Amino acid sequence: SEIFLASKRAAITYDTDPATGEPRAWLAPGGTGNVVAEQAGVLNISWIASADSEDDRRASALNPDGVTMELHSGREILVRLIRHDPAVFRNVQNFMTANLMWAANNYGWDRWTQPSFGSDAREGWADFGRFTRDFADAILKSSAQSADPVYLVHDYQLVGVPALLREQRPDAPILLFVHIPWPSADYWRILPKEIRTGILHGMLPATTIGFFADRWCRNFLESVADLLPDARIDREAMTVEWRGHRTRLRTMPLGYSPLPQLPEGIEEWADGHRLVVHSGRTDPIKNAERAVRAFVLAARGGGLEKTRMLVRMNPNRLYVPANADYVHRVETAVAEANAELGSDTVRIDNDNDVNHTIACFRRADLLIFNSTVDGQNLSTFEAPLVNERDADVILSETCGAAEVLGEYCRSVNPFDLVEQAEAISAALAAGPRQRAEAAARRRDAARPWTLEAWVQAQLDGLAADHAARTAT
Amino acid sequence: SEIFLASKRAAITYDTDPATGEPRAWLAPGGTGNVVAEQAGVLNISWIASADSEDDRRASALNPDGVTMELHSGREILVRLIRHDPAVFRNVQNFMTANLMWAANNYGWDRWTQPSFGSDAREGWADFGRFTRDFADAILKSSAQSADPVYLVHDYQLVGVPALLREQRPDAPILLFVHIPWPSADYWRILPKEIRTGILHGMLPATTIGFFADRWCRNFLESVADLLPDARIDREAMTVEWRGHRTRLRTMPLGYSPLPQLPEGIEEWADGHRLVVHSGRTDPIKNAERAVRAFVLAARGGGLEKTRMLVRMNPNRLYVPANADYVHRVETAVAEANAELGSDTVRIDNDNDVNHTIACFRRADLLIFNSTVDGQNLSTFEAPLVNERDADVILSETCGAAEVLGEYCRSVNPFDLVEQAEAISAALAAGPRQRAEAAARRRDAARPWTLEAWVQAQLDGLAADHAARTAT
Ligand SMILES: Nc1nc2c(ncn2[C@@H]2O[C@H](COP(=O)(O)OP(=O)(O)O)[C@@H](O)[C@H]2O)c(=O)[nH]1
Ligand SMILES: Nc1nc2c(ncn2[C@@H]2O[C@H](COP(=O)(O)OP(=O)(O)O)[C@@H](O)[C@H]2O)c(=O)[nH]1
Ligand SMILES: [Cl-]
Ligand SMILES: [Cl-]
């Protein structure tokens, strides 16, 4: 079985050997390609992604057809980076941020005042076409010798790719996985006509479309039914038929990859106190502002003396106005929490260190993952799995993760400050035994959903859907 | 057949007789009750609504059981106004504005930043319950003598009423009509748990729930399926079964009621120019800001010389921040349109004269009803029916009206400025013959949807659903 994996980025580490000083390049561990390469059915794999750095650009120019990279067990993966036109790639990246598509799939628009699509939306869509073509060409090039290529297409940026693959390769298995939500039909069609229909056209020729959650699958089907009068959907079978394409929709949850010190000052600042931890990158969906306001409402209700709150953020796309504004709104809430509850009750630690975040998970006496919406949210699996304080988890009901862990957490409406405040109070009032037992159940529910099982689900699902599509 | 009609307001005109000077109270023509009273099946009718004025309060106190009011043809209707506790009433009215429920059903929230429900949402919901109880009691009291009462409950404010009527009258036909949209399940859900489920609990005991549009019916069914695990929906039959209640959903479109001078300065200002007219009350859903920006994009494109634009607004609930902000955003756009295109290219006429609005409809060379969303939008039926300039209509695809007239207008995504600009230019470029022919088809499509046909649809639909509910 010859695998061709496309994703937006292939995590490649660039450095010099500490002994020789020679340039070396190596794949990061836990990479999707790495895991796929270890599966039993896989004879070989190539990984196609975008050059997004100067090192990537250089590497791509050095090895245009791709560079073979070694893995443990003597396994190898052919990694090919694509050098897009910079202005195009640059524009497509802004098309993918909360300036457009991110707001579209992650529910960022109020409709009354935003959005208002101008000529920029048309240019962005044109550029997205050129970007999609670049990927399709690279992927087909890489797989030109292969008799029965299997295509795995990951990431929202590559939604246009399946249709182009299918045009050249009518009988190939093609899986598209989308890692973010799919919005309601009424919300999806906020997008300009050529975008709202063109993205569906790009996706449907896949054999299999996977999302992290049932809700996303249903929303996707409703979008298809709403916009594509030629399309026939079946909500029980989770299938679309459209211009002879039969597409199967699947839910394939992911939880975590099985693969330290707290940030400076945090351990002493937190000592002698119960610690509420909210963690997520600097993205408005992570909902930290509301978490802080809820924490304040809870503290007004008392019992929350000797309780502090940490807002751990990983800076990301701060150049996008919605992101910078989110951080600004969070700072405001934190400043106001401190003013009201007393100094240093709430801290933000905003910083990119995965290890610091895991230490925060371990230290927490209460974990809050109260996203406005989330495609899945892996942090809510990771955190209970490493936490050794029997911390309760408050989980928003709109995280894809809630479909798996909702029953084992305090599931909340992420927009209700009162409901969230009451959950904070109850979580902190709960006794050691009750928390110990609930934590154990939570860890049991989270444990099975590993990166490897999720990869196996993709391969198995695609195989079954490939047989079905062939028969029909 | 003894009809009991409940709505939020019964339009009553209070004055003195110009000859005698004696106090006069008379039902406004074209009221819903008036029309229902004229239907063939109807033996008598009572109308229950809220006292919302000093005159109403006084009239209610004078005739607590209700006052018989004469209609043409010697028909009469018993009109009973309810005196609610003022603080409860005042708070329920704010619950019903864009501060809460209006944003819920008319898609006003971005989720990332709004809303954040606090204790006010809980108090608002408590007050809503007291208000709902007031209406149910008054309705039951008015109909206490009736052997087989038929209940027609109109307006969103009365969504809680059917359940209370059903508790006391298990076998009565009850229709609830909702005049505004129903949002996608993911969006409805934003609401606090006790509200999002409590409202469904209140509505479902109706025999029949009507909306102006299919899309609303579907979104309602999805909301039920999403939140009420006990409920069984059928999307083809348009039914819900829940706790022994069988509820039928129906689409019952309304267009217009079959029943002058332009505002000061408008005729002369508009003379020698083609006139683009956008009309709607001061509510963010009417989308005038975007209409103006689109007009500007179109005028940049040229051909739009000797073209002016009127933004006709009817001031409503200006005390609501969303509404005042909308008017503010519209002024800003108009000011900027003039600065760019030349002085006095665009005018706002903001003012409650309904005859004036009709004159604007008649004068228009192009009509724009580009709502972000609209329960139905009757203006888009009225305007082509009175227009005598063969004006094209630009209609948002998110108005319930688009399900009936969409094919006969220029249907647009209300969030796409470019698409809307291109429709403005094409509509103004089109020749007299093509417009004359399109206007005639438009008027033919609009004409059948009268107030009376809509009332007949309700009675017929309810009757059929009552038989069905009885059998099952
Ligand atoms: N690079 C980096 N990753 C982090 C940091 N903190 C947490 N993470 C990881 O980033 C991932 C976040 O994924 P998820 O919770 O699904 O939210 P997402 O960011 O929307 O994918 C988790 O695997 C976290 O363990 C950090 O400071 N830096
Ligand atoms: N009272 C009043 N009514 C108006 C005015 N202008 C238009 N109307 C009428 O108000 C109604 C507007 O209804 P519709 O277009 O469905 O939008 P709605 O305002 O959301 O109900 C139409 O019947 C118009 O003819 C005005 O200035 N004052
Ligand atoms: Cl929606
Ligand atoms: Cl939605």
Residues of chain B in contact with residue A191, where contact means CB-CB under 8 angstroms, are: 413
Contact assessment for residue A369 and residue A399, using Cβ atoms and an 8 Å cutoff: yes
Please, what's the largest Cα pairwise distance for chain A?
A: 69
Exposure on the CB side of residue B328, measured as CA atoms within 13 A: 9
- The closest residue, in CA terms, to atom 5 on ligand 2 is B354
Ligand 2 atom nearest B375 alpha carbon:
20
Nearest-angstrom CA–CA distance, B242 and B269:
59
Tokens of B314: 């009817």
Interchain contact, B113 vs A284, CB within 8 Å: yes
Region at A349 (left for phi over 0; alpha for psi -120 to 50; beta for the rest): beta
Taken in order A454, A460, A465, A466, the sign of the CA dihedral is positive
- Reference A154, options A264, A370, A10, A53; nearest CA is A10
Nearest-angstrom CA–CA distance, A173 and A210:
13
Breaks (C-N over 2.5 A) in chain A follow: 259
Domains of chain A, CATH where assigned: 1-259+448-472 (3.40.50.2000), 260-447 (3.40.50.2000)
Interchain contact, B193 vs A122, CB within 8 Å: no
Answer yes or no: is the C-beta of A377 below 6 A from any ligand 1 atom.
Answer: yes
Contact assessment for residue A143 and residue A46, using Cβ atoms and an 8 Å cutoff: yes
Å from B129 to nearest chain A CA?
19
Tokens of A258: 């099985």
| Residue B70 CB neighbour total at 10 angstroms | 11
**Residue A110 phi/psi, 5° resolution?**
-85, -5
| Residue B263 CB neighbour total at 10 angstroms | 19
Please state, in angstroms and as integers, the Cα–Cα distance from residue B272 to each residue in B161, B306, B359, B431, following that order: 54, 7, 17, 18
A382 in a labelled binding site: yes
Contact assessment for residue A454 and residue A253, using Cβ atoms and an 8 Å cutoff: yes
Ligand 3 centre to CA of B101 (Å) is 15
- What technique was this entry resolved by? X-ray
> Which residues, listed in sequence order, are joined to residue B175 by a DSSP beta bridge?
B152, B208
- DSSP annotation string for A108-150: ---SSS---B-HHHHHHHHHHHHHHHHHHHHHHHHTTT-SSEE
Å from A371 to nearest chain B CA?
9
Per-residue burial over A191-218, b if 16 or more Cβ lie within 10 Å, else e, is bbeebbebbbbbbbbbbbbbbbbebbbb
Q: What is the DSSP letter of B261?
A: P
Q: What is the resolution of this structure in A?
A: 2.2
Q: Which of A116, A119, A215 sits opposite B415 (nearest CB)?
A: A116
**Cα B94 to the center of its chain, rounded Å:** 17
Tokens of A63: 């090895």
- Reference A192, options B374, B412, B294; nearest CA is B412
What amino acid occupies position A107? Y
What amino acid occupies position B161? V
Nearest-angstrom CA–CA distance, B58 and B154:
24
Contact assessment for residue A48 and residue A165, using Cβ atoms and an 8 Å cutoff: no
Please state, in angstroms and as integers, the Cα–Cα distance from residue A315 to each residue in A266, A349, B51, following that order: 18, 10, 55
A280 in a labelled binding site: no
**Cα B149 to the center of its chain, rounded Å:** 26
- Reference A223, options A252, A185, A254, A190; nearest CA is A185
Q: What is the DSSP letter of B407?
A: G
Å from A178 to nearest chain B CA?
19
Nearest-angstrom CA–CA distance, A385 and A442:
8
Cis peptide before B181 (omega within 30 of 0): no
Å from A458 to nearest chain B CA?
27
Residues of chain A in contact with residue B285, where contact means CB-CB under 8 angstroms, are: 112
Strands A76-82 and A67-70: antiparallel
- Edge-to-edge strand list for the sheet holding A346-350: A346-350, A307-314, A274-281, A366-369, A392-396, A410-412
Q: Which of A108, A293, A416 sits opposite B112 (nearest CB)?
A: A108
Q: Which residue of B has its CA nearest to A218?
A: B222
Please state, in angstroms and as integers, the Cα–Cα distance from residue B220 to each residue in A384, B179, B181, B213, B248, following that order: 37, 13, 9, 11, 12
Exposure on the CB side of residue B352, measured as CA atoms within 13 A: 5
Q: Which of A184, A193, A413 sits opposite B192 (nearest CB)?
A: A413
Region at A265 (left for phi over 0; alpha for psi -120 to 50; beta for the rest): left
- Reference A355, options A382, A376, A394, A331; nearest CA is A382
Residue keyed to tokens 């109020």: A110
- Reference B232, options B207, B258, B204; nearest CA is B204
Nearest-angstrom CA–CA distance, B278 and B368:
5
> Which residues, listed in sequence order, are joined to residue A392 by a DSSP beta bridge?
A366
Environment of ion ligand 4 (residues, CB < 5 A)? A 184, 187; B 184, 186-187
**Residue B232 phi/psi, 5° resolution?**
-120, 120
Please, what's the largest Cα pairwise distance for chain B?
A: 68
Ligand 3 centre to CA of A279 (Å) is 28
Contact assessment for residue B172 and residue B205, using Cβ atoms and an 8 Å cutoff: no
Q: Which ligand gives the minimal distance to the CA of A180? A: 1
Nearest-angstrom CA–CA distance, A136 and A195:
19
Contact assessment for residue A315 and residue A353, using Cβ atoms and an 8 Å cutoff: no
Region at B169 (left for phi over 0; alpha for psi -120 to 50; beta for the rest): beta
Interchain contact, A297 vs B118, CB within 8 Å: yes
Which alpha helices (H) appear in B20-118, and where do they start and end? 32-37, 54-62, 86-95, 101-105
Q: Which residue of B has its CA nearest to A223?
A: B184
